[PDB]
Amino acid sequence: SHEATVEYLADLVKEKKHLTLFPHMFSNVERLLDDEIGRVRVALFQTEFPRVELPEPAGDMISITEKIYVPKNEYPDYNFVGRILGPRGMTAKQLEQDTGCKIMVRGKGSMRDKSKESAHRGKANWEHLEDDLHVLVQCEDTENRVHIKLQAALEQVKKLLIPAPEGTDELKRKQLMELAIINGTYRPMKS
Amino acid sequence: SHEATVEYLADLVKEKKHLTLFPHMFSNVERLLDDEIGRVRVALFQTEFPRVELPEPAGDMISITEKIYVPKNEYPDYNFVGRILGPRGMTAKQLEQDTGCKIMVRGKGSMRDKSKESAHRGKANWEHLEDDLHVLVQCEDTENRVHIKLQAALEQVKKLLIPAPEGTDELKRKQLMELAIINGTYRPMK
RNA sequence: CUAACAA
RNA sequence: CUAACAA
Numbered sequence: 001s002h003e004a005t006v007e008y009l010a011d012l013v014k015e016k017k018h019l020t021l022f023p024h025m026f027s028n029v030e031r032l033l034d035d036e037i038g039r040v041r042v043a044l045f046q047t048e049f050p051r052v053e054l055p056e057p058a059g060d061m062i063s064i065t066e067k068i069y070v071p072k073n074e075y076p077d078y079n080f081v082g083r084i085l086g087p088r089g090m091t092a093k094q095l096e097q098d099t100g101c102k103i104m105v106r107g108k109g110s111m112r113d114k115s116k117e118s119a120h121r122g123k124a125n126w127e128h129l130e131d132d133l134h135v136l137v138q139c140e141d142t143e144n145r146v147h148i149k150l151q152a153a154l155e156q157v158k159k160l161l162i163p164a165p166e167g168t169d170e171l172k173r174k175q176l177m178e179l180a181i182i183n184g185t186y187r188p189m190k191s
Numbered sequence: 192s193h194e195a196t197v198e199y200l201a202d203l204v205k206e207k208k209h210l211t212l213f214p215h216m217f218s219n220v221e222r223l224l225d226d227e228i229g230r231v232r233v234a235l236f237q238t239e240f241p242r243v244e245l246p247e248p249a250g251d252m253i254s255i256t257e258k259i260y261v262p263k264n265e266y267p268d269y270n271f272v273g274r275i276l277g278p279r280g281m282t283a284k285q286l287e288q289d290t291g292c293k294i295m296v297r298g299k300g301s302m303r304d305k306s307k308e309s310a311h312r313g314k315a316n317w318e319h320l321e322d323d324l325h326v327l328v329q330c331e332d333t334e335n336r337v338h339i340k341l342q343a344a345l346e347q348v349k350k351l352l353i354p355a356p357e358g359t360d361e362l363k364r365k366q367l368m369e370l371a372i373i374n375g376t377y378r379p380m381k
Numbered sequence: 382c383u384a385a386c387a388a
Numbered sequence: 389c390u391a392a393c394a395a
Contacts (some may be wrong), residue, residue: 002219015219029206029217029224031193036223079388082383088384096386104386112384125388136386179383245394275392280392287393297395303391316395363390370390 004043006177012037013189020188045178047091047171049098052152059143064150070133070161072109073100080164081105083172084135087179088191091171100145101153102138107131135161192305193227195234197368201378203228208375234349236369238362239284243343250334255341260325261352263300269354274363275326278370282362291330292344298324326352 016037019030062112084105085092092103106128111117120126135157139149164172171190182190192200207224210217261271275296276283283294297319302308311317326348330340355363371377 002222012219015217018216019220025209026206028193028199028203028227029210029220031221032223032227037221081383081385085384085386087383091383091384092385102386105384106386110384175383183384270389272392276391276393278390280390282390283392295394296391297394301391366390 001039002039004046009037009044010189017188045174046094047174049095049156050152052148054100054141054145054148055147057142057145061140062143062146063138063140065136065138065148066150066154068135068137068154068157068161070135072133075163080161080163081110081133083169083175084157085161086175087182090115090127091175095153095156099153099156100139100141100149102136103153103157104136104138105133106136107133110132192230195231197235197372198379198381200228200235200372201375201380203231204373204375205378209362210260219300228296232281232369232373236281236365238285240286240343243290243339246335247338248333248336252331253329253334253337254329255337256327256329257341257345258325258327259345259348260298260323263324266354269353271352272301272324274360274366275351276368278373280365281369286344286347290344290347291332291336291340293327293329294344294348295327295329296324297327298322300324 012033016030016033019026019033023030072080083091084095084103086094095101096103108129108131109117110133111120111128117129121129137153137157138148139146139153140148203224207221207228210221210224251333263269263271274282275294277285283296286292287294299308299320299322301320301324302311308320328341328344328348330337332340332346368377370377
């Protein structure tokens, strides 16, 4: 396997732009190239969280939701939500999958556009806007699995609520790098 | 991974040929297509060599080379070399890889074009031509490994030096079928 | 300098 | 009717 660098991915993409013009003549080799582009993307941008080992289901079904406030006040300038979510919410999805939980960002300043927020305030079904910015972590499994999963996701969400000093944020950098590619380049290179 | 069938390998070989028309546009694609051609080639035609077991290196370094003459006299029409080497030398190369040994086919008749042996016979660095066609089998390792390795290769070269009766040579059949698909003379669409 | 989830 | 290794 060729080293996964951004420079390489760019190379593969320019090739993919040309190769896809002849989808029939080159059907097999386009698939091969899609494979390699996919592999290189995963190695570059995808950061993965530890997966935990679970017993087979046994006991009652339990749904459990923990609320963890984001230390927005203590660190007023740090963008915690953006780093938890990731480009297209990819990081949150990765976390959801790896831990078997559901991640939901809620409370004041949780809406993408803070202007629209001020309108829903008080209204029914939006009562969480009265609360401070928090992450809800939620797992539903059987009595002998649900708490294992939860604790796995809690440990990760808590890590992400500790802001990283300048130039040490490996997670953030991968995110921003991918993001630059998404909205700096055209269609054949994003997603 | 796509399933490795001869129909697929053919298809990949077809594409590689079409790619010759774009000299620079698909450098990475050519390399990737080669990797896959190779992977499939191995899946279809690789011989299964018992994986020998190896002690940890202990002892003095030993380089040993054994010479095995091929019974070219007793079997004057049997292509022994062709069967030892294989298509693109891949049979020999794999034996090399599986045993840690080096395989060299030497002697009179050893050169592809015997017209050339004449030109070199008697010359320097070509003194092996004054000898009968034979196979040098060579390994270099520590003492507790080098003889294990060597016996593995020697056993297999010996096997290959016993000709097979007609149309029961599954090795020769796999070899010429790989060779056909890869040169694109055999193009199964099945 | 990320916006998923839910509606 | 397979041609590697070595120069």
